[PDB]
Symmetry: D3
Subunit: 309 residues, 6 copies
């Protein structure tokens, strides 16, 4: 990665997570306050890890396409950093919604995520407004909120997740960076829970209990893991973090996918929402509605430091 | 307690917490669905503790005053179970707000709280509407969100917390039960953080770093721990659980206090909001606004089972 | 329990377990060697717990009916300590098989169970021959090897498991003791795994994923949890510990049930193997074959010490 | 114990330990400062346990015989609280050395012991002078510094350690209290390490590897565990905590023994230093030299509170 | 390693272990079923590590010499992959016994090893028969079952264990692979335990308590660690995992050694069984009998994937 | 580092620590005994890590300037290995005090540090005399004993600590080595504790509660973190480990700093004790007195092995 250290874009999914999306304000301190956070970001992480070395603390910081150009007009721009274009299928739509800054905060204890987030609040006071804050949690043995283990397909063991999450020499000025895409999905849990397990397995493409992938013969072409694994060893590093307000019957998945090239993520989204071939849409979308969709660029630590100067 | 096993009303504060307050609906299944939960409540707890014996899982279930009489007209009524009467001081008000059912869910992992809460959602579908759901977290070494350790005054070590949290033979028909009072407080963190530590210590009545109580000579009469410790060995078992949406600058404390007699809690509230003497109000209320206030009765497990029959 | 301390008969199920059943030999040292173990049993447990206070070490020791009378002719005999009589149904049989001594060894690490067992081997050299040794393990979140959580029905939370596991003043000379019954079951995993989950749930009587008991309307009368919960608040404390040699396709459950009265266990077995009414047998027996069955008496520590004198 | 809650006198041995012995000064604040600590002692423990609920924090506080009478002339005196009288054998002497206050501080982390001790330092400033401070540590699986597991003989499993550590109705005014005796031993490690293991086992009376007690036939009458187990079910609760400055070749054991009656401890000491019969001294004293010896009274929490009034 | 990722051949020894050796059957599905496992092996590991990231799950898969040629006739063959030739000394024999597939499964919980093994059973049904299954456990602080710490000599700290366990460019077509040799040893524990510790130390070549290597002057030339450390910085990565059925008096060590070149392992075996010089055999073989001996090739993950195509 | 593996000079700070400084004696075994430790050092570490893989055991070994030349006259000498020259300011002095060997021992349990240290004592018997032994502990969330988090400035996250701690090709014969400097500081805790928090923050240069660095506008030029961060990306890897004997009112910090070049450490010391500009001394020195100061060279493991030949 040209000797550039990436942010934690190939990290495992935390036990506790905070996703914050901010929009910038037009205040006369906005650029400076954002740059203060850029300058001090790795120090804030150092502080947490020094204080709580066993709590697996991590935070990543990303920038929206318009925000990047506003904040950093002379820094160039990653080749694929452009506002996400809505993908509208015959039935489902991957919406494109606002967001200038993304913070993805993970730790073994929620109190540490809060601590970091509170300092961001203080440092960015007047410079930002909240677009979304979602709190997530690890559910059992890495299950998505629909009760199936998620993440087994992430590159690991015989592949290096950094290879798939981090920009390389194909865009050398931004090597060590990453393209991260987020979507909030709201589930129809009543309809999902009405499906027998065997039908749920056909929707997902893996066995519910033991997480073993369905055989080609058993796996339908519109299974979630069939359509989202686009092939040709093109992969991203994904979470699907549960969030919920059960008292209101609200159950969701916060999708976050880090990629060396956004083209992979976008192809996955095309396969899901349009279908390959057209109409062969992700069956899981019959139970899941995308209500946000935003692309951010996550710079290498080296670049982040330069941004803060 | 007349041989009655209490719910977990003298438990320590969890690492992760969900507070849910429901109102009952007028559906023709409402009483039956609530009774199903009553009947199966200890089984649901058994399941969690059997599956995750090291995760310190706990849930308590309580009933509002009006709800109790609606649901269980022939079961009698605890002597102090009456709708909380708002306490209006010259400056501050402890508001009285709605709530028919309370669930207080605690565990070492938020995913387990979610699991339990999702089953409550399913079992109570159509019988309830959400009044409030708040998610809390343990912050560092048991700090309240204002950065001071909280809970050291809870009866422990040389006193038995059950003695102070659980109804005894003074109301024998409900021995083993508890009166629980909840309040959501929203903090003015900007004003709080502007105070030097030494002034913050005078507001709280303990040292910030080492949690040592201020000496009588140093402790003001309007310190939080001066006014809320009402004396005569009358005590309750309290949490003040942090909650926050930092992206919106929202910082709060979810107060929950379990008592053998609500008269103690009410006297504490009088001391805080009216002052003893009048005007000697809790200085912490200059930085904290109560936005909910509700009393619930938490029956013994024995009684809970009878309620579900 | 007449002031008698029971052995660990209401303990939770260990992470690692060793079940050993010995027969006595006719050697001229047999009684003395057994008495040496009786005399030193609580010391051996003290040693383990002193050395490894966080490893949840436990061992229980029990005696077969014939063995008890051979070893201890003048100590009287528990009222229900008689060789188990085989229960033969129209289709299934709960066999009665040999065993003079039972050791049930549990800990957070298998190495500690081994340590204790090796010392028993040394102390009993020449006095015993192995009838069976089975090693078990906790499987996920307390699942039985058939993939369903087991043990949720064990008395806990609003009931005291000692009340159900320990002999009381109804047999005062043996108060603090327990009746323990063991059975090895071999499963037909191929047939079991061929069942859809919804049919598996009807066999067990609980939901597979969330361990919620089936409703009366949904639960068949021959479900495992219907037939084994005999009613009238008559209960025992059970494990169903997984064991396996997967390379040979061997999958089993080692049943062990501690009871204040063996009559409860025997009634449960009648319900399973004969049926109540006759023919209403445990559906789980269509997938599980009992290959051992033995009753042992587990004395209080006080009595155990006397036995060793 | 007359309804009196004892201090942690039957606690297990901590991972990290601080033993502090203070003498009182003649300052005109000495009694008041000591009483401040008495009054606030259980609060200081509450604070630690509230902040660090999983760190097994404990502290006990005891008073020397002369100090008790100086500080509390009108509180009466425990029947056996008298300055320890040196026990001089033909070869070895159990010395009697000064000490007015004892603090025995234990936790899973040394930093917590330090925290508590620093607050004691602050509260007692000018009122005390240090007689001894020793820091100890748990060594492997509860080994004493001579490489043998220690503490297995402590009452546990089939006996209640409080019964042996806590004063009962035989001295009702002080029920809930305890007699604690401390000795620092310095070892001749070079001589000890020169002994073959089999001879070391004869000195101790247990096997080195597996902690199994030697048989009567194998155990010499002067073995440490033979002479210190005085019989007739008279027992105390002991630690022998390792301490060392290896750079100076200094290896020691800090003995601390809590007893319901000091007469048991004193009889043990007679057996060790004089011998029963005379000359049958503890063989371990051939490798261990007592350099301190002091008796303290550890009051119940109830009494401690009264002392602080 | 030519850019090839090795299997976990330099892993530490698990807390719980399963060793399975299978023979292939002559069924018309055998090759395909084995290839299915090859193709899905890294996915099965990904699943376990995704679900249980803190449980240190690992599995390695190896092939016997004859099996390799049967299954993969056109893949070439590692230079040293040939059926192990029995080493017969004047007194002891390192036997050569059957085995086509080896699975070495390790984790912090035995239930996870079982899970993985059960899926192998299902996937290989009809294609294999069990030759041996042995379950092992970590014993105390990494002790072998003879009570001495084992594994300290494994390359680590100032050497890289992969260098010694993994084939390099000397056999480039198989770089990233490993030669693994397994032997089951049965111990004469009665004879071993009859040896004084000082003689046991001379058999092993290290001190029993502190694991310090004997000095050259003290260490006999036939000590286990003298004869098995062949010199010239030629090393392998070894376990000696305890296994036992104590009820039958059966105590064993399951030897498993991973090597970049089998020539090192074979030289070690020559030193042990024949002696260097002849007759200078491993003294530990006077207490240990080899009852199996088989060589397997453990391919890199890259190659394993190709094998499964 | 020329392919040389460094000792643990960029390790995190242990939970428990032992610092030992020895002087050599003039005995006729001194060189040989030191060389025995050199030869066996990595083996001793291997043993600890093999036995206790989860206890984060570490030890580093360093040599004083005079000692190096005495022991190893023909090995050359690191370019900056010269006896530390006392730095005397107008008010404060960084003293230079004796020491020939340094051992820095860290682990999650103090018993493991003791174990290692005891073996060093045995191996070095007669060859050394103790200059200092200090025991340290981690205090809360990595706080120095003055109650502020320390170590956040250590290179990490976006920098590699080895780059700053380890000698590179600028001194190729010693690449992989490190310069370590130790100082014992004694604090005036009474004066420190009398400072309001806001003044303490000005002395340190960070906020006490949240460890956030003071802004340039708020941070005085004589703040500890201003003067010790010398700039130009010149950094060392530091601990400031707490030690104390609270009973004597003794509170200290054991400074230890590992550096690729001692010139950085020395410049830091100049800034602290003399001031840059002169007189702009570290304000923390108004509360901290240096009582030792010694430089040691910590060789790579490769070189250490050669030294032991
Ligand atoms: Cl931590
Ligand atoms: Cl710019
Ligand atoms: Cl797009
Ligand atoms: Cl758990
Ligand atoms: Cl009613
Ligand atoms: Cl009211
Ligand atoms: Cl332990
Ligand atoms: Cl008898
Ligand atoms: Cl029967
Ligand atoms: Cl804790
Ligand atoms: Cl008095
Ligand atoms: Cl005396
Ligand atoms: Cl895990
Ligand atoms: Cl082929
Ligand atoms: Cl060969
Ligand atoms: Cl460990
Ligand atoms: Cl030299
Ligand atoms: Cl210098
Ligand atoms: Na501005
Ligand atoms: Na209805
Ligand atoms: Na005999
Ligand atoms: Na005074
Ligand atoms: Na076929
Ligand atoms: Na010499």
């Amino acid at each position: 990665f040209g000797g550039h250290i990436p942010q934690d874009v190939a990290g495992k999914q935390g036990e506790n997570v905070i996703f914050i999306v901010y929009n910038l304000t037009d205040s006369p301190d906005t650029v400076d306050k954002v740059k203060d956070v850029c300058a001090n970001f790795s120090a804030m992480i150092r502080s947490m890890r020094n204080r709580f070395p066993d709590m697996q603390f991590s935070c990543t910081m990303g920038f929206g396409a318009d925000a990047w150009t506003r904040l950093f007009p002379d820094k160039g721009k990653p080749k694929e950093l452009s506002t996400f274009s809505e993908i509208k299928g015959e039935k489902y739509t991957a919406v494109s919604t606002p967001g200038d800054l993304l913070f993805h905060i993970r730790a073994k204890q929620m109190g540490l995520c809060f601590e970091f987030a509170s300092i961001l609040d203080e440092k960015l006071k007047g410079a930002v407004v909240s677009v979304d804050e979602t709190h997530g949690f690890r559910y059992m043995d890495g299950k998505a909120i629909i009760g199936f283990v998620d993440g087994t397909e992430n590159p690991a063991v015989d592949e290096n997740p950094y290879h798939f999450a981090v920009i390389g020499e194909e865009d050398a000025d931004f090597a060590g960076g990453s393209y991260v895409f987020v979507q909030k999905y709201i589930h129809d849990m009543v309809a999902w829970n009405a499906l027998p397990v065997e039908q749920q397995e056909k929707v997902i493409g893996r066995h519910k209990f033991n997480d073993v992938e369905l055989s080609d013969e058993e796996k339908p072409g519109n299974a979630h893991n069939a359509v989202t694994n686009i092939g040709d060893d093109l992969k991203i590093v994904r979470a699907n973090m549960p969030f919920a307000n059960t008292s209101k019957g609200e159950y969701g998945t916060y999708f976050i996918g880090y990629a060396s090239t956004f083209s992979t993520t976008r192809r996955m989204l095309e396969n899901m929402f349009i279908g390959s071939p057209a109409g062969n849409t992700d069956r899981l979308l019959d139970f899941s509605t995308a209500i946000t969709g935003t692309l951010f660029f996550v710079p290498s630590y080296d670049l982040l430091g330069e941004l803060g100067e």
